[PDB]
Symmetry: C5
Subunit: 208 residues, 5 copies
Amino acid sequence: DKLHSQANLMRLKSDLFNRSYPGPTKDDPLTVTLGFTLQDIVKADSSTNEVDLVYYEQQRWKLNSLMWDPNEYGNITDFRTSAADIWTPDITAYSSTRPVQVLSPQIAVVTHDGSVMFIPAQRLSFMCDPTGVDSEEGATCAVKFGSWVYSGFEIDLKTDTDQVDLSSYYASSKYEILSATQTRQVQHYSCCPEPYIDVNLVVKFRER
Amino acid sequence: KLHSQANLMRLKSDLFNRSPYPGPTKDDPLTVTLGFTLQDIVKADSSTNEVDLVYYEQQRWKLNSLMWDPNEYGNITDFRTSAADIWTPDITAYSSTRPVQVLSPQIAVVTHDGSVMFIPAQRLSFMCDPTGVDSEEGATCAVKFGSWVYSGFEIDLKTDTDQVDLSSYYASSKYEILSATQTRQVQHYSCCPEPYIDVNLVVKFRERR
Amino acid sequence: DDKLHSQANLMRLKSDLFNRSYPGPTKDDPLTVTLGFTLQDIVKADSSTNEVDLVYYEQQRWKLNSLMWDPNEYGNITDFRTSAADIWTPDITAYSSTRPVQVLSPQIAVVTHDGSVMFIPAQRLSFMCDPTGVDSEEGATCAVKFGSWVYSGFEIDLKTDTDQVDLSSYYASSKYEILSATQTRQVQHYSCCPEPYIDVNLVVKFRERR
Amino acid sequence: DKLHSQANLMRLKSDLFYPGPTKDDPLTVTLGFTLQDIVKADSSTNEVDLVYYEQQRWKLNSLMWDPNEYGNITDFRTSAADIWTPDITAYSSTRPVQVLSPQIAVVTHDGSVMFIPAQRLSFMCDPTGVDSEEGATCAVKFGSWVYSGFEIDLKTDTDQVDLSSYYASSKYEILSATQTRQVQHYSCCPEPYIDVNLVVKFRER
Amino acid sequence: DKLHSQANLMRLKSDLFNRSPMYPGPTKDDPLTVTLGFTLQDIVKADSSTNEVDLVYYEQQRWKLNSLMWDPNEYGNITDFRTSAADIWTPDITAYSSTRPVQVLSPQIAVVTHDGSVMFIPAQRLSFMCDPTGVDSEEGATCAVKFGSWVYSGFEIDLKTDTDQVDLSSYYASSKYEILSATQTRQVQHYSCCPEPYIDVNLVVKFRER
Ligand SMILES: N#C/N=C1\SCCN1Cc1ccc(Cl)nc1
Ligand SMILES: N#C/N=C1\SCCN1Cc1ccc(Cl)nc1
Ligand SMILES: N#C/N=C1\SCCN1Cc1ccc(Cl)nc1
Ligand SMILES: N#C/N=C1\SCCN1Cc1ccc(Cl)nc1
Ligand SMILES: [Mg+2]
Ligand SMILES: [Mg+2]
């Protein structure tokens, strides 16, 4: 039995990854759903106005080219796969000051309806003035995330909720979270006439 | 000696070329045994609440596809191989604050019964408030380790003991270990209804007197 | 059906362009790279080593005949996104960096049917800069040149659209405020070689926020 | 002539280009350390940083040739990626080692290989006493991570660390530095384990 | 005309690299001489707590291989070309007393000329063993660092300089440190492993606080 289930998977993957995705286009656009789970505000540097966050970001999208019929494949309904084997969106912070450091395995889950889920954990340094962190109202900082190169005509972004998930926030962090929201926005950049979509992460925090 | 080399090369070729591992599935789940050997608490940063640990993580699992009959291969009963040649579990700390730094060669040992042993040494920074480390009672912190992407239906975990191996702990570390335990736990994450399995490392420590 | 066809068309175009045939510019086939800087933040100024750290992105544009197509032969595809590894890109280098530049954006470019390419890397750069005076009304002045490391002005020319650095995305709560920032084309000569080399010199006047 | 020698070498390398040692086909690796500098001693974390190079030597039958079949080529330089190399590891490092020299080895026609990696290492070391006449003492063991003494034996030519290239203006002076082969057994396993223990006594210059 | 020039270049590069097995490096029977020369841009940092100094410089390297020769007449009168350093053999020039891996600051691209000669000019940031005691005095501090092939003896790789004077023409004028002198000198070394002599170029820099 088990030998055939392994074989059914190896076959599914072979069939998918070796019979045919060039990325989204204006004719074939994509919606990426984004959500943030903030784990820690590690460091706030008032000498450079950089703050370091640890969080994970749930990403979801769906491709017709990743679809299969589970009956054709021993009732496999989903699988884990290296993120290198598939297209992934180029979700980038707009005001980082250091390259993101990746903290989790680059492996995604693909489902038979063609939907993909990928949940990278990251440490990010970004532009933030923490003046006021030692006050009751705390400091407020914001960072936009979205595709670096795909306009709103190729990649649209959505959230499931405007509330950042704080259920895993580190109970003994140096900083407590007063509020954290994630909200879709439209931008234009100087290069191009097309609008570009971002999700803006806004965090209000203070010294515990 | 010529024959023995040829026998090993043949085995590896048979296993890695002439045979078809896409990872565990709900239909073919895997149990990984995990244990920790703590070598050093290097740094405890009270300004960011990060602690740095150096440890070895013993991983063991068994695959039917790695099995062979030693009698067919000159009585070879195990071999060393690059961790790149085989599947390995995506064991991840839940509350790291920086990418782990790998401190040992990425080489595993495969045995004829299909079992694999792999023992990466690593430096880890993780979320830990060291308040109390300057007192008799010390500081206590914890970090969970488990598959990032495979639920308990695909990867289960277990330990061989509740006690973290402290027999190699650095005798002149800045910190001494009061207790160190490792315990299987079940978690649920927002994305998904399935349970995810971890081994929780709980360490009580204080400044050396 | 339509979405299946558009994908097939793009895959086919990319196949035709990249699988079925550019060794860089030469004196017989030279190239112009238009450069523009958008300065986001002066992160740090270290007076103990005379290094300043900047975050910016750099818009780069050029055009190749080899990247041309008729949208009509490809379902009216007029442009596409592509990994920067799939195409030639110019070796634009800061002359007085003190650390390898850190890349902050995905290495992906946009290619248009007229053969034009746009690539906009975001970078954190440490460069040689004496911040003396930063604590004064007048501020400090530093400069860093950007150009091809290996291609002379006979192979790669540089152009700017304006001599003004784009400050519309400068971080409003940076430790440093920008008094002015200019980008100016220049010609240099190096010891190795008789040929002139082109650079764009970024000059930044800044002070501690007041 | 020069084109003939190029082709002779190209041919030798192609003709030559081993799954590692085993209980049945064990290997002895000779090790020797040359200490260049104690760069840093951090009393806040008990870490010390060393710069040194390590001479590694071993011999493989699979790497032998007759020079007369190859234009009297007696040795060649080769990328360490092209050959098997021993997984010699510090056992109490606190950072990944940093490689300071090209990963190229020399192979000789008798199948012997020489490889001399220079490295910066941070390792577990309490420097208490460095500011006194007696100085500080620290130790770090080096050995295979994955092979037991039944697969890889270690040999040294000397128990003296080579100090002839020690930086004369280092922040730290070396009082002594030894490298001692140790054989031991652990609770887990019947087979012997072999390491070379580097012991360094040093003090502020 | 331009399309022919590109075709000529890709043909030449295919004839040299694609239809020839990579040069196996120098040997006693086919030895090589590498010319080296340094251009010092900045002494960035001098750490008296560890006795490490950090230098930013570029290093011009030149060598010549018969296997890289062509007749420009067979190739549209192409007399030289830029190429990725990964396409060709390059010397393993290493500092003997570095304390961290070198950081590369320029694109790893070289120029190959039709006589088989190669020019490659890497910019690097190097930390090396140096006691800066006396940098705050009029006489300054003196440090030295040797460079050469880590693995090839003088029977395989010899070195030479064009001058014993380090090029100071691009030294950062507002560095924390001023250069009093900087020389580069060929030496013959013997290492413990081996009877053969090894060649280095010793860089000696005298410097003091600005
Ligand atoms: N949310 C969530 N899921 C998390 S956070 C800790 C690990 N996981 C499980 C998971 C599940 C699926 C994917 Cl693609 N990635 C991760
Ligand atoms: N200017 C500009 N464009 C920017 S800055 C933030 C992301 N973008 C959009 C973009 C558009 C095209 C390319 Cl090649 N790269 C980036
Ligand atoms: N000397 C010199 N040349 C320099 S320093 C800054 C860029 N250049 C031009 C150049 C020319 C050729 C090569 Cl191989 N490398 C660099
Ligand atoms: N000992 C020694 N040899 C050294 S230290 C500086 C460079 N060399 C020469 C060398 C010779 C051979 C090999 Cl494999 N590696 C290095
Ligand atoms: Mg909106
Ligand atoms: Mg070998």
